[PDB]
Design a protein around this ligand. Sequence first.
Ligand code: CLA
Ligand code: CLA
Ligand code: CLA
Ligand SMILES: CC(/C=C/C=C(C)/C=C/[C@@]12O[C@]1(C)C[C@@H](O)CC2(C)C)=C\C=C\C=C(C)\C=C\C=C(C)\C=C\[C@@]12O[C@]1(C)C[C@@H](O)CC2(C)C
Ligand SMILES: CC(/C=C/C=C(C)/C=C/[C@@]12O[C@]1(C)C[C@@H](O)CC2(C)C)=C\C=C\C=C(C)\C=C\C=C(C)\C=C\[C@@]12O[C@]1(C)C[C@@H](O)CC2(C)C
Ligand SMILES: CC(/C=C/C=C(C)/C=C/[C@@]12O[C@]1(C)C[C@@H](O)CC2(C)C)=C\C=C\C=C(C)\C=C\C=C(C)\C=C\[C@@]12O[C@]1(C)C[C@@H](O)CC2(C)C
Ligand SMILES: CC1=C(/C=C/C(C)=C/C=C/C(C)=C/C=C/C=C(C)/C=C/C=C(C)/C=C/C2=C(C)CCCC2(C)C)C(C)(C)CCC1
Ligand code: SF4
Lengths: 164, 85, 30, 735, 80, 201, 91
Amino acid sequence: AQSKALPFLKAPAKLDGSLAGDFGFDPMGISDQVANLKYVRAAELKHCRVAMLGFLGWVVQQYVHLPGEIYAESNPLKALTSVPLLSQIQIFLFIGAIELATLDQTYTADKPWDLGFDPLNFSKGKSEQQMKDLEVKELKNGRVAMIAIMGLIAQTLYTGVPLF
Amino acid sequence: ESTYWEGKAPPSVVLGPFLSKIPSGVLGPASLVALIVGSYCTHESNIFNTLTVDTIYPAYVLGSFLTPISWGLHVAAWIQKMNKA
Amino acid sequence: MIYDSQVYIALVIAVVASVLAIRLGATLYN
Amino acid sequence: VYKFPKFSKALAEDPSTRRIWYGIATAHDFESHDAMTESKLYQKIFASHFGHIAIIFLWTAGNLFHVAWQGNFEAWILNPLKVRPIAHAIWDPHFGQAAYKAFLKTSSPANLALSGVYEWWYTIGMRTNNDLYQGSFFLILLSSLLLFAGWLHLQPSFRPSLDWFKANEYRLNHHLSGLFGVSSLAWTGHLVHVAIPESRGIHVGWDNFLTVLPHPEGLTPFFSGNWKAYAQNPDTASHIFGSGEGSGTAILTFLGGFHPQTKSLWLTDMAHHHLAIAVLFIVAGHMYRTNWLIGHQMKLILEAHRPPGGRLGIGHIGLYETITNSLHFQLGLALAALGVATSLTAQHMYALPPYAFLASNFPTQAALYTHHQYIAGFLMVGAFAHGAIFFVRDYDPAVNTRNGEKNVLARMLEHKEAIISHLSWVSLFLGFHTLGIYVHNDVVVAFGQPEKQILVEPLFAEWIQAASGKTLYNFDLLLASSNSPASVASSQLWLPGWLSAINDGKNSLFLPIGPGDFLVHHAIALGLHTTTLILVKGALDARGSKLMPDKKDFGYSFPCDGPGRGGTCDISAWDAFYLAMFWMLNTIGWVTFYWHWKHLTLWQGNQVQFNESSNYIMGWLRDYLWLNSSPLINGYNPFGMNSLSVWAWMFLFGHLVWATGFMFLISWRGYWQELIETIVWAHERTPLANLVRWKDKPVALSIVQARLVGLAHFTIGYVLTYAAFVIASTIGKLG
Amino acid sequence: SHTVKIYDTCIGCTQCVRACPTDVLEMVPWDGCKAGQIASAPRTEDCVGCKRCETACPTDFLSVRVYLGGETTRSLGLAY
Amino acid sequence: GTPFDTVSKDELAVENKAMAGKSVFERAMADFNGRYPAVAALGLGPSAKAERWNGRHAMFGWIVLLATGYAQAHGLLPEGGMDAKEWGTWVIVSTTNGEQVTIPAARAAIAIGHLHFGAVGVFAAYSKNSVKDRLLLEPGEKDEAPAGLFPALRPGLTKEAEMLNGRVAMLGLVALVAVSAATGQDILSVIDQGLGGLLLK
Amino acid sequence: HLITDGRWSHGSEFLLPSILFLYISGWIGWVGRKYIRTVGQTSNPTEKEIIIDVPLAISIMTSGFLWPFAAWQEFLSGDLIASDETITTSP
Ligand code: CLA
Ligand code: CLA
Ligand code: CLA
Ligand SMILES: CC(/C=C/C=C(C)/C=C/[C@@]12O[C@]1(C)C[C@@H](O)CC2(C)C)=C\C=C\C=C(C)\C=C\C=C(C)\C=C\[C@@]12O[C@]1(C)C[C@@H](O)CC2(C)C
Ligand SMILES: CC(/C=C/C=C(C)/C=C/[C@@]12O[C@]1(C)C[C@@H](O)CC2(C)C)=C\C=C\C=C(C)\C=C\C=C(C)\C=C\[C@@]12O[C@]1(C)C[C@@H](O)CC2(C)C
Ligand SMILES: CC(/C=C/C=C(C)/C=C/[C@@]12O[C@]1(C)C[C@@H](O)CC2(C)C)=C\C=C\C=C(C)\C=C\C=C(C)\C=C\[C@@]12O[C@]1(C)C[C@@H](O)CC2(C)C
Ligand SMILES: CC1=C(/C=C/C(C)=C/C=C/C(C)=C/C=C/C=C(C)/C=C/C=C(C)/C=C/C2=C(C)CCCC2(C)C)C(C)(C)CCC1
Ligand code: SF4
């Protein structure tokens, strides 16, 4: 009834109105245990962003490579082992440096997903409806990418073909 | 509610809202049939014919599971009979 | 025989588990 | 003199050293802390559980890392029956050249591993010092996960409420199905995928596991229902473990008995066992009701269980709220179950060795059995102590009573005198007659006429052995007969393996028993009954007695009620635990003495020595202790030393700690307060030391603290001296 | 400091008061017994916990009860 | 699960508005000081006092590393191993087949020199009332104010100059260890490469 | 070796001595209980326990040969078991 995604079920109590992308999709009632939807939305958006970047990297590594030889592997899962540990540890350290401040931030803030990242100011001057539309676009694209990046990983692990 | 009881038989609510509405004249014969079927399945999988890897027969196994069940069915049959059902 | 790199990174990871332990210890209060 | 017992203002105002001592011993009694609520209690317990699991995983990771780094795991793989496993290296500056030379193993002084981790890890499919390192890395990662979770669930928005903590049905469904069944399913997956091929020479690592089929048919029989295909072609009787010679392709079989080479359970047997356990527990995890309208409400189940004629009172009506609202009832239940479970582990891992080449590792066998039996005794005593604590501080008679009539638990306090009197009668009966028969044998053998001994054949226990297939006592009962329905039923499934193992003199499976086994089993029964008597008496009498009809108002642990009314020493329920610890130690000592002597005679071959000398006490004293203590005490002599020197030092250390416990137990307070006052005067009235003064007034240890310290010394000395003796005796006698 | 409670089973026999070594108990007027007196504990800060008070109590299960609690240099009997 | 609340409404996180703005360095310092007092009040941890002391030690240790490379190159740094008969079994490292490999004598000498310097440090630590700059913060003393991303460009023997040079030396040590770990050569080999060859010549 | 499973074939090892001891011990317990209950109804019950009434003691002791019959004649009359005058602790 109240779920748009599952037009027959009634959504849970915490799925209503605000927090764009709310289509009443919580059949298992996971939202009933979390105190609020702030942390789960932060986790969902982090997954969405990481999955978008992962899909883009998957395709680009399929087609484009860095000039060096160590980056010449086309299969992303094979490149996970071919690439030297120095590059991967540098990436991990960069991510952890970004992650510790946001670790302090996420567990207490009202909008843990709002990291203040807008270098090009794509949100300055946008109205509330436009901002909500942008949030919906981001969430949609992220969910589709998550499904897609998991599918790419599965098909590479099951057939060895990284794409198509 | 109030599954607690002190009389001769417990209230029918202790049977769940599926056995609470079965007439005792149905549960009784069903319990006896289930017990006989389960005993025969157990005695056909084993005892009469020795078990082997090639002979497991999910019917006899699933059947044999009716013996433990039978116990519950006739307990419920007695509970229904004593509760005027 | 394990290498110096194997033992060193295990020691580094053990340090990280130590900082997580004091954070739990301090969060369980004085 | 302040701020240390942050949880207790009453202790923080103590001007004496008692504040420091009591600050340690009350840190984990969260229910007694200042400014205490139930929500904070459950949240703190939850975080402490997370930290504890992290500690366990870190300990396992450390064992793995030290075996990988300083052990000889790889060398032990190629020769498991001759190479002695190494636990970790030794760096001690106090060593002389002789100690370095004696403890020297390969490249550095090291300790032999008596934990049996080598055999366990080899069985589950580890062949490289890099496999152990991966396990250590993963376990440290898991410890980090658990520490992060423990920190997280103390944060404001992630702290669970009382309803979540007391949600019994959800926790049971998940624990049973998820934890037990799914962990068994994952363990079956690992067993098959990795362990089964690794025992057959095929390496299945974290690289070629998505492409190496655990079975040649590959999941086709499972979906097709042809589940017999996974049992076809098992490992032959000439299979060399870890090699493809004589191997098979089956992954789930019934074989029974042991591997002909490793003398341990078949890996395909254990995989099938865990798969069956997984299916059963996953099924059983759907019993209780959750958000989907089907299942059970355990309150209704408990309330509806009142016998109609009426002999349990009103039944179990008040038990749901009693258990749910008390953390000591649940803790006691869990501790009792864990004690029984680890007793089971001890009793089954020697009769049915599950790990390759563990049967021939006699020192590790003895160490494992002794360790698990001592842990079992500790857990049982803890269960009874927490039952007593529940009686003192959590039991509510109103909840367990309906209109005057009392429920199943409240009725245990009505015939408490009957229970205690009959426990006392059984204890006196067993003690009187076991000691009488033992002393009769002592006197009769001493007078040179051993034929007049009273030797009772354990026919009841030998009857059980024959029922399981042992054709040694000429009973021809159930499985000792080839015509009984019990034998014809499994003649094609697991009897040929089981019979071949039970009817073998080199196994520990159903060891042959005689009159000595009878007498020692009666001694064990006496010990169990007396420990149970002490613990049950303390639990039931916790809320009051005739000497103290208001004992519940004084708490679980208090020193006494004074010298009045004839004297009230050791009247609290804590004192019952304190007294029962000695009896638990004595009973576990009897059990471990019996096990170790039986297995020393079995391994050495002189089983006639046990069967003859075990019927009288001097036989024990002379042939077990005095005989096998010779290698241990000669770990260092005025002529030299051996690698057993550390065990002799630990032997003497245990004796010393035992006697210091004797100090703390025999001599009580009051005698130590006046001496401390004299010392205080001496310090206060001496120059060059008046400049230094204490901040906490030095006082003698409290009565309860003194009892605890004496018990701790007694127990630590007991454990250390027996561990040293058993290990050193096994090592020095059996090569 | 320890806690001392008096219960109406008091018969006012004064044996508790004259047994206290630290002058914690005293006899006060009452109308619940023949003697017209009941024990009181107005100076529990000096209570040492020796329980001599309830060793001299003739009533069935006591009328003076000593509950040991927080410790103090007075309650620990410390001359230093 | 559904008929109850897993987290009570009375236990909910509140956003800390007291850290508005407050760049990650200020936020981290404030979080450390509030979360761990009595070690923050002593100046330990992410503090200007600790940073200054560690920078001084890093500069002195760059000097020590140069001296060690020079000593190794110029025939100093004694040869062989320690005498187990003279210094006990604690100096024995391993026994391969009948020979005892001991701690190198050069390592022992370098440890003795480092012991000299560390002893000087320990004396200065337990000499707070007679030293110009103390190791820890007095109760009341407040930690010097962080210098920021770029300390003031004040040449000479100034606090800013020592601060900048200590930061540079600590970063250099971090880079040296990172290069040695990533590439796989000895620390002195990395220093030799980073000096062209003028050290181990 | 003693065969004490209960078979009458080896009945002289445990069963017959068991019967003999049960008779003797029941005799002892019966005469003790009878003496306790007999001097328990006199003016000074405690005095007659440290200073035994030897005439009455001898009278009771030689009467224990019927203890199996006396026990299953006092249990039937309800004189063997107390009911609720027995004391109980607070809980
Ligand atoms: C599938 C979901 C799931 C899983 C895997 C777990 C798992 C766990 N929970 Mg948990 N929990 C869940 C759902 C789940 N929970 C839910 C839904 C709730 C809310 C209702 C809770 C509420 C909860 C609380 C409040 C607590 C836990 C705790 C724990 C941990 C117990 C300690 C431990 O490591 O045991 C490991 C145990 C095993 C691996 C198995 C033990 C094997 C036994 C001993 C052998 C028995 C075999 C046999 C029967 C022996 C007898 C022989 C037979 C013949 C009779 C464990 C990690 C506790 C903890 O430590 O928190 C960190 C704790 O305090 N949980
Ligand atoms: C998982 C099991 C478990 C859990 C959760 C608890 C939890 C609890 N118990 Mg409990 N207990 C357990 C098992 C458990 N116990 C067992 C197995 C026993 C039997 C031995 C007991 C016996 C017991 C008693 C008798 C009492 C408790 C009490 C308590 C409560 C406070 C604990 C406290 O203050 O610690 C204090 C911790 C210490 C004093 C540390 C003692 C450390 C010992 C001495 C070992 C250290 C020596 C070490 C081996 C050194 C080696 C020497 C070297 C030379 C080799 C708390 C609720 C107390 C209470 O008031 O409950 C309400 C209480 O009176 N328990
Ligand atoms: C002679 C009278 C007599 C009788 C009929 C009983 C009967 C009983 N006693 Mg008992 N008891 C007695 C004397 C007696 N006792 C004495 C004198 C003592 C002090 C040592 C005890 C100490 C005792 C304990 C500690 C326990 C019992 C228990 C029991 C019960 C179970 C039987 C048992 O364990 O025997 C126990 C018997 C003994 C331990 C030995 C008794 C010592 C001698 C043989 C008895 C005295 C003979 C007497 C001097 C004869 C004088 C009579 C003459 C003048 C006419 C049972 C109700 C147990 C119980 O409650 O179970 C329900 C229990 O735990 N009794
Ligand atoms: C990358 C992406 C968006 C990236 C946007 C970025 C970084 C924007 C960053 C900024 O705005 C911020 C944040 C703040 C501004 O102030 C600054 C900038 C910097 C401007 C979306 C991808 C979104 C990606 C999506 C939705 C991908 C969907 C993929 C699908 C359906 C793939 C399907 C398949 O892969 C399978 C499954 C199997 C294959 O075999 C077959 C096919 C069909 C190829
Ligand atoms: C790089 C470093 C620290 C980096 C920290 C970072 C990026 C922190 C980032 C964050 O905080 C933010 C930004 C925001 C937070 O919310 C989150 C995190 C992510 C946490 C420290 C180096 C620190 C490096 C140090 C301290 C070096 C010390 C060296 C000394 C003392 C010298 C010793 C010697 O001289 C002797 C003693 C003897 C000689 O023989 C040998 C030598 C070694 C030469
Ligand atoms: C300051 C220093 C040493 C100072 C020494 C002092 C004061 C000694 C003082 C003395 O009193 C003593 C103690 C003892 C006396 O007997 C001797 C004297 C001399 C009198 C070393 C710094 C040493 C500093 C070093 C080695 C710096 C290395 C930096 C690197 C590699 C930087 C790399 C990057 O810049 C790139 C390349 C690209 C960027 O984008 C990224 C990064 C990574 C930042
Ligand atoms: C004090 C108290 C408590 C505690 C208690 C305890 C601690 C108990 C213990 C208990 C126990 C510890 C018990 C045990 C039991 C056991 C059993 C019950 C067993 C059974 C078994 C069986 C039944 C078996 C059978 C068989 C056989 C014999 C053969 C084979 C097969 C079969 C299975 C059939 C609580 C807390 C609760 C509460 C409060 C009070
Ligand atoms: S303890 Fe009893 S006696 Fe000693 S003072 Fe307090 S009351 Fe008087």
